[PDB]
Design a protein around this ligand. Structure first.
Ligand SMILES: *C(=O)[C@@H](NC(=O)/C(=N\OC(C)(C)C(=O)O)c1csc(N)n1)[C@@H]1N=C(C(=O)O)C(=C)CS1
Length: 357
């Protein structure tokens, strides 16, 4: 086994030239190894203010937020508040168009509604406009047959999934996922009292934070530090060490396999590949194409497979994040950066570090 000093050398020797070549100002890395988190921090959280990254620095998780959304949805299933087989119209009856009749919560959660678009338009800022947006949508393919990664898909899933709870999405997430897991520095809205910890992201050398948008919390809006994200990876890698609960059940539902595209299996938020897998296969299996692709159905959904590479990429304008873990080996990694850099490079970096363990 690797000593703490040897592991720090592996991470530093990889991350240092990466940050220089990509012009990433700051990064926080957690390696999960032998049951323990190991934290490594580099560079600047705020370039203009010369503030260093620390384990308390908050980063925008971007689409890694969808792993929280998927687990919250799984928790709602386990509470028997929703079913993935329910029609979307059970939770939004105003969607009366014929194109919505056959669409299920499963389709929203896993991007199979038939071509819901990537983003909510920026000029959609209220519920009447969001209703008109979904009313006007014309599918390209029958539901349950294609995948098109889309914030408007799982974003709507998250908003509908919490309706039986009576809570807004942010409240439900805090009460049912963040608090039980003691993720006390993980935020959909960063409190005023925590702003000193909030890194700036950098796009073309310019400091930027994510802008509000409808369905942002569900799809790309969580902020967290490297310690909370290590805990999140530990909880999803080893949920059997948690007490029995609907949240533990929801973790299992979110790592269940619902569809297959090539070597990648779609969970709720999480994505999975069978382990062992080569790095090139993981890279080729983590491209969210602009175009639709066909899916293979996993019916019934397959329960979580310990021999899996489980991961999620995510970015905002100014941040790039990545989480991956292998339950069979009990290793995992969190990579938080305040510049967006290519997803294949995140995969390659993570894979090389985990390979040393
Ligand atoms: C999660 O990270 C999602 N990312 C986004 O929604 C945002 N941008 O995605 C684009 C515009 C493609 C990008 O340049 O990164 C976003 C939220 S807020 C903000 N200022 N930008 C999905 N991320 C990917 C991915 O696989 O990396 C996709 C191609 C679909 S969107």
């Amino acid at each position: 086994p690797m000593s703490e000093k040897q592991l720090a050398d592996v991470v530093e020797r990889t991350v240092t030239p990466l940050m220089k070549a990509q012009a990433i100002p700051g990064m926080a890395v957690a390696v999960i190894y032998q049951g323990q988190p190991h934290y490594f921090t580099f560079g600047k959280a705020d370039v203009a203010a010369n503030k260093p990254v620390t384990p308390q620095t908050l980063f925008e998780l971007g689409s890694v937020s969808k792993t929280f959304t998927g687990v919250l949805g799984g928790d709602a299933i386990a509470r028997k508040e929703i079913s993935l087989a329910d029609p979307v119209t059970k939770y939004w009856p105003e969607l009366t168009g014929k194109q919505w009749q056959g669409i299920r919560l499963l389709d929203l959660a896993t991007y199979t509604a038939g071509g819901l678009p990537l983003q909510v338009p920026d000029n959609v800022t209220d519920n009447a406009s969001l209703l008109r947006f979904y009313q006007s949508w014309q599918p390209k393919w029958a539901p349950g047959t294609t995948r098109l990664y889309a914030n408007t898909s799982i974003g709507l899933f998250g908003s509908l999934a919490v309706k039986p709870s009576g809570m807004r999405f942010e409240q439900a997430m805090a009460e049912r996922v963040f608090k039980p897991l003691k993720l006390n520095h993980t935020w959909i809205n960063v409190p005023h009292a925590e702003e000193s910890h909030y890194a700036w992201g950098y796009r073309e050398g310019k400091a930027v934070h994510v802008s509000p948008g409808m369905l942002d919390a569900e799809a790309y809006g969580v902020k967290s530090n490297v310690k909370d994200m290590a805990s999140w990876v530990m909880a999803n890698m080893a949920p059997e060490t948690l007490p029995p609960s609907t949240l533990q059940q929801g973790i299992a539902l979110a790592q269940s396999r619902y569809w297959r595209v090539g070597a990648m299996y779609q969970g709720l938020g999480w994505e999975m590949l069978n382990w062992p897998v080569d790095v090139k296969t993981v890279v080729d299996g983590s491209d969210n194409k602009v175009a639709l692709v066909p899916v293979a159905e996993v019916n019934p959904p397959a329960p979580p497979v310990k021999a899996s590479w489980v991961h999620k990429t995510g970015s905002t304008g100014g941040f790039g994040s990545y989480v991956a873990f292998i339950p069979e080996k009990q290793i995992g990694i969190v990579m938080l950066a305040n510049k967006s850099y290519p997803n294949p490079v995140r995969v390659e970096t993570a894979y090389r570090i985990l390979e040393t363990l």
